[model samples]
Target chain A: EVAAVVVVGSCMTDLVSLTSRLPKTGETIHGHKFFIGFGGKGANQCVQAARLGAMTSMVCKVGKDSFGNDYIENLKQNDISTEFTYQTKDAATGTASIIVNNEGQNIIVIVAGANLLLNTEDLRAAANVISRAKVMVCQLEITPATSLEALTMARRSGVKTLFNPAPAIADLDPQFYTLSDVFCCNESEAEILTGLTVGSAADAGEAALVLLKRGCQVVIITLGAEGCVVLSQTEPEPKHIPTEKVKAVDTTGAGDSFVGALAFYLAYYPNLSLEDMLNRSNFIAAVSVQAAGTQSSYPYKKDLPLTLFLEHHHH
Target chain B: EVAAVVVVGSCMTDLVSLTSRLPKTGETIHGHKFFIGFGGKGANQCVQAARLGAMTSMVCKVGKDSFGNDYIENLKQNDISTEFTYQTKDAATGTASIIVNNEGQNIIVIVAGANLLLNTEDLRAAANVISRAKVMVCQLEITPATSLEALTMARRSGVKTLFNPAPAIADLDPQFYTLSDVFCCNESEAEILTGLTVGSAADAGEAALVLLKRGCQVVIITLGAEGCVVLSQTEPEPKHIPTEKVKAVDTTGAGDSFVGALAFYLAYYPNLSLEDMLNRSNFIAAVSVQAAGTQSSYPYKKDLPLTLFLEH
Candidate 1:
């Protein structure tokens, strides 16, 4: 039987333009081509988790525009539940304008439209569904109030919670420390949370220690291309896990894949060794970065190198 | 059975940004919202002709990109034939960035990617389809060389033709006059073609005479709220048809609807009186302007007020 997982997030239409170079302020430039795709930290993570065989459900809001109508069909195609999703008539769907240079580096600007209208009622409506999950995942793509209330609900229901503090917030409520069971963030977010620069794996470990000490049972900090540092309450000190090398094509959703895979294996195989769990997460992320686009690049569980799944499940 | 109309046109993705006011150059301002939709003068007219019961087929080129795929789907939904539509990897699909202010005015800039790559081979491939139509239609959104080649092919095949000279080109090859059977343009375009100021019915009549003398059999000039003036080899003088009144919502695509409806009626009822044809075209244009969006606003023939449609 599959362990159910609930993801609270935002959905956005990403308009990616391939250009020779980014334009300077007040300068207009020609792009070689442009494409539209699904994006948003919450949506990317949820879709990746669902593709890995978790019975995933999403709680989010979209506008009643063309993008909103297309987004629902996208969720259904991924086999992710839309029962808790909502639509608002007041605003247009959120969108991200991305300009990817020839080198695959991108500069993005997001306009949060109806994504800002996720309210308390939306969270309450999914309470029963949230309570059924062994793990509830969230991110800051949506409103802070809704995310905080969701984390509180999962805690009260005795469900483990994972909070991915992405894009490094300037101000976060202090209560988030006590509310989250596992805190995951990138190098910049870790620095923002702990006020420590992560130049190396050891530096990430030092920042992970502070987050774990605050209140979280575990802290994970991602170091781009270098792997991540983890600090568990049961460990003597922060443990460093270095990722194997791979030529990265686009690093857009690599972190989301890592977080979602961690949550999926954590929910189903809670007794799996921490090193084994992190190894699988890192391996899956390595496969994701070799491709382009966000969700389009995610590998299905069956597509994964069988040695990885067999090694974990055979035990 | 309906008359078959083959249209050579362009399809584009319109990114509409709605704002309170237009921004000054080198200044950035917060926009209210933005959305993407189907646009392009050629696509709009073909879509208009199809919704009005013509068995319409399109001959256009779009890039093998996201907007190109979505555009094909939109054509199918409207019952327009895509058999002649071609996709090329040489360039991305064309796009229009339109900023609409609160008063419904707009500033538009177009990037004609794959649309610019339309060539003589594309016109040759659609030769059979173009030959079988009661009428063939074209616009200048794509390369004029292709539009010129297509018009020449339609002429050799004995198919009636309508040419919409939009966006007002300052210089046109003299050969275009003999190639087109019916030449349609707005006041500004008429002024450009003949160097005559089209301020009233008489000025438009003078411009029509020049086009007719240049070898076009018929000439039509659109006059906004006042209506249109038509001059044909069979008629002694230019006839002006007064358009009905309606509070215009968005004037964009009104001329496309006018030209498309004119072609559709001419194809289906070949011998219908010219006044009746122009009258029906103006009525359809009236209904289109009261709504919003381009193709989203065009009314199906059956959906129009029966009296205006039935009278014709």
Candidate 2:
């Protein structure tokens, strides 16, 4: 009961450089600016959930270096529990070196150091928190086997499971679909999972229907700037949920914000229709894209309109 | 003199990622390894001089971040004076993002950060150290005006001046040449300065002669593996100093090693001929290319053959 949303995931420090253009082989160029930020799909989701007043817990591994210690402090500052955020000296903290050019094009190189060491034993140690959560979120950043074990454990305990197969693998295990109560992905991830072109809402609906038939109770495919398509077992027909129109500055964590908002709605407003949840989650995500950075862009509960909280309580 | 070798330079943290190949635009790839090392031509040269038992001093600027604090500690650990090593909150520590592929090719991007903030006021504060040093070394990593002022101060006080125009600029100030008692550079740098091809020792000799006429007392051009060519006012004719050949693992800081070894001989063995100094520096640099990393590869006095230390 203490943990409303539990995320079993990964954490990476993003080292970014802004340059005029990408360098050629054996070339050296001067960059305009350089900065570091906290990133990783799992960490981004957990931070968004925590910012929205969800009692979130992060269960992951980081290195014992300065970056890892800084990450632990970042989670604590966000009011998220880090009881299961273990550290080890065997590897350094994960990092992503990203180069952004003047035209917004990017080239990235990722080193999954300590994140790759998050194994089954670490999940076993946090099994109690996973079973007690109202919503358990898992992503592909960590090892798939560990994510599957965590998902399987949550489902058995009557906890709602949210599975996001991002950076998707073509040969995903069949059990992931059956274990997830709410299976979600973006357009590209949907294409990877279903092998279907998702260019429009109609295309997304087709992909959602295909995913719905796989075994999950619900399937949602998010299309950036176009909202999302949701399909559930009770309502087999795909419903496109449209979001507010806003100018986006940086859409780095928009998808994670949506998923985290969806988890909040599921845990707090259990009786709300899937359509209503998707609509509200889409609004929150739209607000996020207007700002820059990942977790830094997510809105806190107080930043939201009071009507959102009042309308749900009145219902 | 309290300081035998004084270096006015810059410090940078090199963040390197090793991968199978380079990533294309709008692509993300997994790298095999990621590591951080201390680099920057100024600091590399100072570390080499300190390791060779010279009384060294570092005058530079780094940010107040962790990398800067660590760099100060690194200099202290090497027994180099940090009296003029300033820290500022104005900018973050300078850094280099390097991606090295399996074939050993690399692409790099540099952020100057605090290094660009090293200015004339800093040189004024360290003028005493610059004037008292037996040898003063300057490079283009920091502001050129600051390097010129330091070199001018050393020359005015009769201190030997060593100038290395690295990451070379096309419109170099003519004063950099006249102020240098020992003007030295590698083949690429020699090419940039003299606008001449330096593919061979004989070619380097031709380039060195051109540099010598520009008012510097001595001009030495280093050719990796092929050795070096030295020309001075006393001799006027270029002499090729051949080095011991060895297999190279990483040549990152080999040039800085040679420069630092040159400074050591200039300060400690001033009576030795320029050819003798270049020959000994070539031997020391040959030992460096056999290892990896920048300052990590430089040989300490104890690591060198006792004969090299006692020969002259």
Candidate 3:
């Protein structure tokens, strides 16, 4: 029986608009546009994985407020499971204000509206699919203590795990690194992990090796188009894998695709060669960039043209 | 002996700033300098009149909250009696946003915070000083019906009355105007009275004539830099009194000055000629513009340099 990939964390509505500029002190100004929709790394990862052809489910908390109700509608529309998704009345759902400049640089401030309330017990119930799943994905957007507990449980259940250490936090329990099979991060996060300046591919690769030695089995240093360095514990040497060319629009969720595609391939093949996994996943990352927005930009299995004929190298 | 000039109305904090332009449909932007000061037509009238040497007191409601307490402190700082001020948990003190442009042209928005709760009974209780008052002043910044009742009570007591018909309301009760001794208004407000646009001295003088015919003993029209016009029913000719020229800042409370100065002058001089009242008030109004900001610009007794004194 194939197990479903479970994503546990905060799922929120992203309410965004671009205003002319902020009002000077005591000045009254109005906003130009207000587009409210679903976001939150938790839901984004699950949606991206599900769209990449993985059976996915999400566990999240939403307030009884307007934004919460809308987020549930978004889950159903995206075909992600809503079984463990709970409703709360205590506070409004989470929201974020994102300002994107013409150069594609963005300044974002998040109000963790309802995300402040999730506890460890909720994480325990959401991880019900752990034993039946091939991989569990988690992030630090919620309580770190709860993420630590879930990481321990997934490891005990013998489920593979992928961790994206975003919204950087203090060090996780030593057990987390040991339990995590694949650890993913972008340039700044990679610098945070290894404490080394990751301005170039070499810096990222060096940081990946440090985390590699710290217990992460397979470390993919996402050098971001100087390509990535794939390092494995059992493999003799690391391989430099380049990305497929595409003009990126809102590159917000491009990294989530890497983790989602990796888990998708590993769940089906279970024992595919490392080179095969990287090659197949790199192509999936390329297809994601043609569209605008995060998570939603990921391509599905039916849409991947030559994935079926690709040679599958097995152990 | 003359008693205090009693003022019953609102006390509020005015927040002003400048914007390049007013925000249009769906446009949000930041504004420049944020300035906060004492305002509200009723409060301004009392404070300015007090500065011009009218022993004034205020009666009104403010939130039991912090901002309401702050308003009490501001009033006391200017020697205006706040003993009658009540603090309530139910409402907040009123506030207004004043946006003045480079040309001294302005647009304003007011949130009638605590003003919505005042009743006529409160007005009656605050009118205790009317019997001995030199001048009883009231304005429409509060419950209009209550202000009218106060006016009728002052008229019955044989005390002089002044009314500032600011932030003009719907078809006014004619009896209220008939009871007032004097009616004060600025150029923009005068337009609402005569259905005629207020522009030149002739336009304002003409508007003052209509209000005087409504039964007011005197109609004083304040024309910003163009000065004032005093129209009395007994006088055969209208008086065009020009203001002493001074650089203007926030023309925010000039009208309050006109009303306050007149109240103080009438109180100072027991029974002065209509021309004499206008002359002393026009002098007081001139000093009001020498400084910036509302009420703050109004002169105290020591600051007045009148060459002629009103004989009692």
Candidate 4:
């Protein structure tokens, strides 16, 4: 019953519409296409980890509705354990209504329904699963206090914590920084967290250093197409790890792909260097951006190169 | 094999979001609620007919997608036959994204998708069903040609034709008027079709006369809350029929409810006076607007006062 990577996060059904141009406030326009897909950074990251052959478990709450049932089935199909995936009759499943215009620019309206209902009591119920995991992942999609509680439990149990503060909030609890074992954020999220311009690798390195000083043992700032920068307490100096260049069709879930890959490496190949893991995660994420959709675009372990599955022995 | 009512039209999944205000272009907003429901004028009318005990069948095309699959299931649940409901892989199911603000004002984006794929060939495939039905319903949700073809076939077969030119188009082919046995439209659609302001029952009467003169055997113009006005070749003078005044919660499917009820009466109570039928249909439609959603708000036969279902 060992969990290799555990994620306590959100599950959202994305209702997307593609139109020629954004609709005016009171105008109705003809859209080119319409579709519904699975999303939510927490589920996206967990799916990527499970697809990469990790023994993953999703600790979350969905509504007692069709979308919620489908979400649990989706997780089970991906070989992720959902023993702690609870259902509530109080709210509908989370949803994101996105309108992508011809220019590829989009406007979104998110109803965090059941995701916002994930409380600390739910975490206490899954404390054993969290404590027994090799690495526990969390994001801000759920209540910040619940995420903080899970991170605290995992850290106290010696479980490595991967915290991604996405959809970044300006008034974040300071405890989030100290509880995270490995803090991660994308370029835009990095800028939001540190109030610095993260336009280049050098800028990211400076931002990572600032985050590392906030009591986290390690910090990584991902720069899309430009690779990533990493700083750790032991390493002191920052190192830039570049990724393979690929034509990105949709960059939706690239960040989650990276975080999931990092979680997989941390749990299984714990002896790998921080720089090496970042490089490998970057490569895995690059493959995701070249396709469309979020979880649908994630690469499976069988489809990836054998080099990515190499194991490192600990002395 | 006797289909009392056959509907050749569109099926759409409505994705509705309720918000405090509409989102500005390129801006995001938090919505209060989100729900998905079954809609489309054809399906709505067909479901109403079936719910009222008509042996109904839907003649249309949906996509080979989840929404389409759900649509077929929805029709079956409502006791409507899908014998001619075809599925295609070339497109996704039709959908309407609606944003309703606190003021009840709304905006919508519609993708016709597989609905627009319903063509004359599909009608030809369902020709037997159309020819045998007591009443065949057509609307502008599908291609005009397909609707026209269905109406022409029904007319030739002596099946009473119910044509609702909704989401109206101007410069419509003149044959639509000649083919329709019972031409129905709302105030806005009537205005669009006849190019006359239909603000009152008198206005609607003038519009109906113009439509009746175009060769339709009968024309009915539905005025929201104010009831409807009817004109026919037999009763050339316009007559206003009033519906019961009721508090309307949501008027989404009120019009379709009326059309379906009228279709049911045409098929089962063919000998009843046209005025009597319109009165019963108006009562049924009034029951719908008091509830929410489209088909969900429509009343089942058992839910209505037994008097409405009494045989003439």
Candidate 4 local lDDT, A1-315, one digit each (tens)? 688899999998888889988876776677988887888889999999999999999999999987899899999989999998989998888888888888788877777788888988889999999999999999988888889999999999999999999878776899999999999998888888889998999999898988888889999988899888888999979898888778999998899999999999999999899987888899899999999889999999999988888876322
lDDT of 3 at B83: 66
lDDT of 3 by residue, A36-131 (tens): 457887888788777766787777787876567778888888778887677777756665544433444443445455665677767767656766
Q: Lowest summed lDDT over 10 consecutive residues: which window, candidate 2 chain A?
A: A306-315
Model 2 agreement with the true structure over A1-315: per-residue lDDT tens digits? 398899998898888888998987788888977777898888899998888889999998999987899899999999989999999898888889988898878888888788888988898899899988999998988778888998988998999999999878877898999998999999999898999998889999999888888888999999999999999888989999888899999998899999989888888778878887888889899989999878999999999876555445332
Question: Which candidate should be chosen as best, given lDDT against the real structure?
Answer: 4
Candidate 2, B1-312: lDDT as tens digits: 398899998798888899998988778888877877899888999998889899999999999988799889999999999999999899888889999998889889998788888999988998888887899999888878888889888888999999988877777888988998998899998888889988898899999998889888998888889888888888888888888879999988899999999999899988887778888899899889999888889999998988767655
Which stretches of model 1 miss by more than 4 angstroms? A11-38, A50-129, A142-145, A165-178, A187-223, A226-246, A268-287, A299-315, B1-5, B11-38, B47-135, B140-149, B157-160, B164-251, B261-290, B299-312
After TM-score superposition, what is the CA distance of residue B95 in candidate 4 from its true location, in Å? 3.0
Instruction: Report the alpha-carbon TM-score of model 3 versus the true structure.
Output: 0.52
DockQ of 4: 0.47
The alpha-carbon RMSD over the true interface for every model, in angstroms, is: 6.5, 0.9, 12.2, 1.6
The backbone clash count of each candidate, in order, is 0, 0, 11, 0
- Runs off by more than 4 Å, candidate 4: A27-33, A63-69, A87-92, A117-125, A187-216, A229-245, A301-315, B24-30, B63-66, B87-92, B117-128, B191-215, B233-244, B271-273, B306-312
TM-score of each: 0.65, 0.95, 0.52, 0.86
Residue A165, model 2: Cα distance from true site in angstroms? 1.9
Docking class of 1: incorrect
What is the per-residue lDDT of model 3 for residues B242-269, given as tens digits with 9 covering 90 to 100? 8677776556577787787777777777
* Most TM-score-accurate candidate: 2
Local distance difference test, per candidate? 0.82, 0.88, 0.70, 0.90
Kindly list the per-residue Cα lDDT of model 1 for residues B1-312, writing each as its tens digit: 233788887898887767676554323333567777798889898888888888998888898876788899999999998987889998888876555567765545456788878899988988888888888898888888999999998899899889988766678877778887898999988998889998999889999999899888889999989899999888849999999889998777889899889888878877778888888899898889999888888889789876645533
In candidate 2, stretches whose alpha carbon ends up further than 4 angstroms from where it belongs are A310-315
Tell me model 4's lDDT, rounded to 2 decimals. 0.90
Please give the distance, in angstroms, between residue A19's alpha carbon in candidate 3 and its true position after superposition.
22
